[PDB]
Amino acid sequence: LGQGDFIRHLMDLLKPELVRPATTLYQHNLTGILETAVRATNAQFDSPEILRRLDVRLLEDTGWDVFSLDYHVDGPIATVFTRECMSHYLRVFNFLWRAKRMEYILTDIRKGHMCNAKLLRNMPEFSGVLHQCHILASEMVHFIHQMQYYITFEVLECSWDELWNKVQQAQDLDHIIAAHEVFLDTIISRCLLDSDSRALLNQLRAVFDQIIELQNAQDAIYRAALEELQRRLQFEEKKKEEEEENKRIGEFKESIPKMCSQLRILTHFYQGIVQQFLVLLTTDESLRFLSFRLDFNEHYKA
Amino acid sequence: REIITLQLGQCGNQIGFEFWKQLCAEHGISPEGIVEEFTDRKDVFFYQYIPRAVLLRVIHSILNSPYAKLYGNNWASGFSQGEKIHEDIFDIIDREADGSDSLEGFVLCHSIAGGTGSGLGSYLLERLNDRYPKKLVQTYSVFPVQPYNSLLTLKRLTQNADCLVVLDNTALNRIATDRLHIQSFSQINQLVSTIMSASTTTLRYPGYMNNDLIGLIASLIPTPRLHFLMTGYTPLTTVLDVMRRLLQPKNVMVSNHCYIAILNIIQGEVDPTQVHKSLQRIRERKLANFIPWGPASIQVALSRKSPYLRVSGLMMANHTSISSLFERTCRQYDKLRKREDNFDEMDTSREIVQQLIDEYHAATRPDYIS
Amino acid sequence: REIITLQLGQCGNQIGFEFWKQLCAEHGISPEGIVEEFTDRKDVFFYQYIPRAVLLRVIHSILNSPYAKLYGNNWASGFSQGEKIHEDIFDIIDREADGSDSLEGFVLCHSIAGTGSGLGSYLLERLNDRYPKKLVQTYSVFPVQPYNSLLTLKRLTQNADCLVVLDNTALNRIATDRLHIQSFSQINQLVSTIMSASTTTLRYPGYMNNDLIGLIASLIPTPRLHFLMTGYTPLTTVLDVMRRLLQPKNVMVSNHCYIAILNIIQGEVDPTQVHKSLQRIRERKLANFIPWGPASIQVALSRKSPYLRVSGLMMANHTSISSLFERTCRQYDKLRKREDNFDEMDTSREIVQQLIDEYHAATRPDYIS
Amino acid sequence: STGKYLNVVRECGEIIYTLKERAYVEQIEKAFNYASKVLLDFLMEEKELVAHLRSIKRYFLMDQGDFFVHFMDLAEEELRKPVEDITPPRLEALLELALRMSTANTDPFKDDLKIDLMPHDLISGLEAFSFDYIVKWPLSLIINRKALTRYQMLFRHMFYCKHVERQLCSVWISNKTFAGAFTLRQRMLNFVQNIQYYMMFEVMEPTWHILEKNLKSASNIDDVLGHHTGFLDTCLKDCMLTLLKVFSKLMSVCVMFTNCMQKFFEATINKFDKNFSAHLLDLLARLSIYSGMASVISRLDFNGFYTE
Numbered sequence A: 001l002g003q004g005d006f007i008r009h010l011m012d013l014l015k016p017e018l019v020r021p022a023t024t025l026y027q028h029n030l031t032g033i034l035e036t037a038v039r040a041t042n043a044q045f046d047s048p049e050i051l052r053r054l055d056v057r058l059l060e061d062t063g064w065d066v067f068s069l070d071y072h073v074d075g076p077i078a079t080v081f082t083r084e085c086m087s088h089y090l091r092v093f094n095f096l097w098r099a100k101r102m103e104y105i106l107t108d109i110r111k112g113h114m115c116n117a118k119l120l121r122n123m124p125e126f127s128g129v130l131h132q133c134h135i136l137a138s139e140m141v142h143f144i145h146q147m148q149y150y151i152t153f154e155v156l157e158c159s160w161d162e163l164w165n166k167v168q169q170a171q172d173l174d175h176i177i178a179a180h181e182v183f184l185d186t187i188i189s190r191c192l193l194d195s196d197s198r199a200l201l202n203q204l205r206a207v208f209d210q211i212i213e214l215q216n217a218q219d220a221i222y223r224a225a226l227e228e229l230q231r232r233l234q235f236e237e238k239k240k241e242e243e244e245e246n247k248r249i250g251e252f253k254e255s256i257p258k259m260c261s262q263l264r265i266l267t268h269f270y271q272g273i274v275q276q277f278l279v280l281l282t283t284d285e286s287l288r289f290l291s292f293r294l295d296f297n298e299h300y301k302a
Numbered sequence B: 001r002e003i004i005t006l007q008l009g010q011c012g013n014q015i016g017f018e019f020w021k022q023l024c025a026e027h028g029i030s031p032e033g034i035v036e037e038f039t040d041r042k043d044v045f046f047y048q049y050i051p052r053a054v055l056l057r058v059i060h061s062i063l064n065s066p067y068a069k070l071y072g073n074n075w076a077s078g079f080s081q082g083e084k085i086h087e088d089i090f091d092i093i094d095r096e097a098d099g100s101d102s103l104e105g106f107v108l109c110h111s112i113a114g115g116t117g118s119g120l121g122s123y124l125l126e127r128l129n130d131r132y133p134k135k136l137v138q139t140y141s142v143f144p145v146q147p148y149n150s151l152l153t154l155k156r157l158t159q160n161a162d163c164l165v166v167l168d169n170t171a172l173n174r175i176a177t178d179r180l181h182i183q184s185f186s187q188i189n190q191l192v193s194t195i196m197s198a199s200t201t202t203l204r205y206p207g208y209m210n211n212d213l214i215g216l217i218a219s220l221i222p223t224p225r226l227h228f229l230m231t232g233y234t235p236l237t238t239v240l241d242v243m244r245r246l247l248q249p250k251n252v253m254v255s256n257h258c259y260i261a262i263l264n265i266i267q268g269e270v271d272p273t274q275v276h277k278s279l280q281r282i283r284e285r286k287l288a289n290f291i292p293w294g295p296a297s298i299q300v301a302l303s304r305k306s307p308y309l310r311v312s313g314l315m316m317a318n319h320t321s322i323s324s325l326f327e328r329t330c331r332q333y334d335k336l337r338k339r340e341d342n343f344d345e346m347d348t349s350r351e352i353v354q355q356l357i358d359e360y361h362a363a364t365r366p367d368y369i370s
Numbered sequence C: 001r002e003i004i005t006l007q008l009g010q011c012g013n014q015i016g017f018e019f020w021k022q023l024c025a026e027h028g029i030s031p032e033g034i035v036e037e038f039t040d041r042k043d044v045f046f047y048q049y050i051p052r053a054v055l056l057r058v059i060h061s062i063l064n065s066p067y068a069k070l071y072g073n074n075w076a077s078g079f080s081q082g083e084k085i086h087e088d089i090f091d092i093i094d095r096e097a098d099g100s101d102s103l104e105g106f107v108l109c110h111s112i113a114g115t116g117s118g119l120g121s122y123l124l125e126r127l128n129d130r131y132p133k134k135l136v137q138t139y140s141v142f143p144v145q146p147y148n149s150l151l152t153l154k155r156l157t158q159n160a161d162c163l164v165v166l167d168n169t170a171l172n173r174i175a176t177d178r179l180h181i182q183s184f185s186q187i188n189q190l191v192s193t194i195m196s197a198s199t200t201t202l203r204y205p206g207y208m209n210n211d212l213i214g215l216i217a218s219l220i221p222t223p224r225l226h227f228l229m230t231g232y233t234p235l236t237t238v239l240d241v242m243r244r245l246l247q248p249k250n251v252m253v254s255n256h257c258y259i260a261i262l263n264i265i266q267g268e269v270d271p272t273q274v275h276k277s278l279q280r281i282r283e284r285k286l287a288n289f290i291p292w293g294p295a296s297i298q299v300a301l302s303r304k305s306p307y308l309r310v311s312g313l314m315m316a317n318h319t320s321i322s323s324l325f326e327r328t329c330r331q332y333d334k335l336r337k338r339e340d341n342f343d344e345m346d347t348s349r350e351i352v353q354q355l356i357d358e359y360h361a362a363t364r365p366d367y368i369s
Numbered sequence D: 001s002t003g004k005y006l007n008v009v010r011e012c013g014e015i016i017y018t019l020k021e022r023a024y025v026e027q028i029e030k031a032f033n034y035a036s037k038v039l040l041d042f043l044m045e046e047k048e049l050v051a052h053l054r055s056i057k058r059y060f061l062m063d064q065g066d067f068f069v070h071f072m073d074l075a076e077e078e079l080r081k082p083v084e085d086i087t088p089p090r091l092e093a094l095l096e097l098a099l100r101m102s103t104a105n106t107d108p109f110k111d112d113l114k115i116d117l118m119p120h121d122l123i124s125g126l127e128a129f130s131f132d133y134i135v136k137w138p139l140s141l142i143i144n145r146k147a148l149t150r151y152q153m154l155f156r157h158m159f160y161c162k163h164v165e166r167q168l169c170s171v172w173i174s175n176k177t178f179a180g181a182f183t184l185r186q187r188m189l190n191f192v193q194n195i196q197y198y199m200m201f202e203v204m205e206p207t208w209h210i211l212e213k214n215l216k217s218a219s220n221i222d223d224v225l226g227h228h229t230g231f232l233d234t235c236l237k238d239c240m241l242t243l244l245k246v247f248s249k250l251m252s253v254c255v256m257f258t259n260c261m262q263k264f265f266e267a268t269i270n271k272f273d274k275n276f277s278a279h280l281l282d283l284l285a286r287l288s289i290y291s292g293m294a295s296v297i298s299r300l301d302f303n304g305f306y307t308e
Ligand SMILES: Nc1nc2c(ncn2[C@@H]2O[C@H](COP(=O)(O)OP(=O)(O)O)[C@@H](O)[C@H]2O)c(=O)[nH]1
Pocket: B009, B010, B011, B014, B015, B072, B073, B111, B113, B114, B115, B116, B117, B118, B142, B144, B169, B185, B186, B188, B189
């Protein structure tokens, strides 16, 4: 995902496809989408040879669980990757794909709220519970938008620098293999995909899940306010009866404290899984640079 | 995703023209809109080359410039004249919109100090909030009967524009007299265009993060109300020196208190391994404060300088102190309200800006929620 | 910890403008506010480089000087007009305060002899209201003139947490004796030598004295006896320099004893014969101190700027400074018998008498109680 | 001693027998005299040991002033907390930020400072803080754990004396807007700022000045290993670090008096006087009875005071 420009467009085109279950998914359809992205983004100005090997493969649920790129390599270049670097990259690509859709979700929600308040800013009884929907977002996007930086600077840009430095000076093709083999033993270690760090990754997945449950409990509270707004628009534009709606408007105000008890218990459980997440980082050394990224200004730790 | 920009009024048109000059110089594009021989993603702001601009007297000056091959004083008068030519300008806007593959936003560069640009931008913001509901609207508004127009622009900007960047001519003039020794528009506009060009750096040079406008917006603005940002540009060497010179109040273009969100953009060829040490030491020495309620942190990103054109850096901040500026305007309005059809719109504007200032003042409390 | 300085009146501007010029050259900084390539701590006075100064028709003389890119006669006129711009000049100081990391002091350069007298009297009052934890050191310069002079002394004895006296009379002698001038453009060259060499320990960090409150609390024992005089010999071992500082020919001042002495040796002298000279000064008894409290003499070394030889400066807290007041006190009563309440002058008159009595009581073996 | 010099440079970057003629004895010297000249010059120009000992002196002996006045100013609130209550991830983040913001930024070896909280005091929170220095292999022959804890024993003794008169001088402004304590503060300030001057410019400095010159005439490593431990056993001897526990209890009444004045009685200020002045006179009584350890008295009193 070191391109950014190409993977951005590729996540917008696979959105209508991967939402369907995997049974209706067939590989021959997605290739036309991938080929379209390489032609649209800046990846078109590129060597035709390396673009001949870039393809798709389907892991064997939902479309966001079986999609992944392969970049198969055969020939003399295959003695550097040796079927194990291609079994480690896909082991890494899953973690970079999840941490990329968990971000484009949180910039979609943060986009909805900028067009949300531009419509229902006339209902002063709804902003009391709509507010808890914003704070929980800006508290959740921090944990994700910060982990993205630890992925860029302390995992990719730092561990790749120790590779391009031990290649422009290495030789005999046996200091290159040993410099590229350890380059895949630090990324697996700096990311939480190790063998003895299992308790840490399964702890992170729960935080990845709470982002989805918010996105499900948001549009339910979002759409329920647009219906009542749309009815309130037509209930007065055609006439400009009065007693049979005040009970409908009156009951609508009574359902608000019910939704407030959702965002009050969803937040109080989200903070209980992050404040537990940090305790697990104090276990193996480069992870300490992550505890500072999250705990800046000591928003947690009292 | 393509960003379309609009230029209204004399100030807006001039700063947009200088921004386009700077951006064409950053790439290999001659003033004749022809690529020069001599990696940089240029599709966002340019159409295959022609810029995606909509200009709205100085147009004759631009047409006499070598870049010809590249394309009253009341608020109420501006609003009325903008209402008169709604369809005329909106046909152009709609053809340029639907001509694009996937529109993303509407950059608006205008001066809210006064004239016709203020009311015209007000009307355009209202109509864009009406028609396009899924398009982000960022505004590079420039701060200076003037209080009336300014407060009306603030009233329209605090609910429509999904983001905003302030630029005060007073601070710019102060910096010009301090470190440029001018005593002019054509000189402060240089620094303005520099800040603007450096603002959208991460969009043109792709990096690990920040490949879209939402990546820049959703990180800083936590709630839909607190959407006013300030800028800082220190180079007028390690990243620690840059970050220490950035947080100094001497460089911020602004005339208790704490921070909401900070973003740093480093355009140099620095060693990217010392950035975490820089942040560690900044947290150690405690040079800046944050909100007490929510977890707010500082984000830093790197990029590459234009090779056709050294270490630089820019900082975008969400500081609660900006409200102070509004107060002044507010104050003046009161002073103007007691000295001299319905005249109620100005009262509603005062009401909503009072709401905004109260929200800012309450944001810096440990119980800002509820 | 940063120190924001102030300059008031024609005097404060001229000494400060020549104080900065001495500092800008002592560092590798071009007058264009640009560092020259050509270790020295420079963050205290300069902000990353811009000096932290708040000046207040000589201003135009600075704006035409090559350093342009680096930034009536009644005491009542000074205090009155200062009240009319209370919000104006405090906007600048406040915006310059919070922009700094952690403010430490306010080095204020003004002469008590026109508007600098009345305005400075206004500032030193107003600073103690808003900023109650900020030291306020002043490099006041001594010369209706008896009136404006003593009135500032009322404020300088209860507000300013320190004060360094520099009288033009004793300076004019050194201008005549060893420089043979007969001019303001020359005596200020000596003043700029004293001001710059005063803060040499802040800009060059050593074992001790890395903060302004370290130089203050050592000399000033009690909040009242807060007046210091200077001594600068170079106009060779440490014994050669130490003996010359104690001669009355070098002090910038026109029984009696010292209270605390601090020696600044800016040479490359080896730090091994520093205790031998102090041992010798005790034997020959070249200076006496207070009998009541334990008073000791302190010596500090530093490093000269390589971009610009042994020098020496001495910070002294001498009781003989009470003499300068009596000259002001005397001429006041003469003008009081020669010509809405006229009570401020008499109230100021009383508190100056309390101060002089405190000095002459400081030389008594029973100064306590 | 010849080949060993050749190995600490290689990994980084004819002889016949005669009797009654020493054509080989001279031949060994003509090579040993080059075996050393390549290594000694390797340490002075490139990676400029003498340019390695100076960095340790800046923090351990607190030579650099701009680094401590900015570190204690930031990490004070987080040191008064008790032991086993402070997270080292919080201190080290302040140490890194203390170095870069200060003027110690121009130091190639600054990245070897680590926080090490000792379990025992100088036989909590503040009295259990001390730097730790990690060095590589070839230099670890000179500066090792046996002769680095000594650098860490005479550091805390100087971080204590720097802390007291840092806050004793802090109460100097609080009282300055009941009136007999100013002449007692004079009795403690003129004691610590008369110990610090003797401890910095006339004890360690002189010994350091000698060592620098005493390493230009070195001939073999087991001599440099003598000019070093010969410098640490002298600093620990000329100072009160080698007993003289009256200094430890003498410091308690100084720091505690700062607490009393910080609680803003008249019968307590005079109580500290009779207690501190009695403790001081015990010092000069033992400092005088000996065979410098005698010139310290001339530093404590200068006006003939304390002549009792
Ligand atoms: N910063 C900046 N502001 C400008 C510049 N040119 C004009 N302005 C601002 O624009 C305002 C005048 O707007 P005006 O041209 O009268 O608007 P119009 O009536 O619609 O044409 C002034 O208050 C200026 O502050 C410029 O070059 N730089």
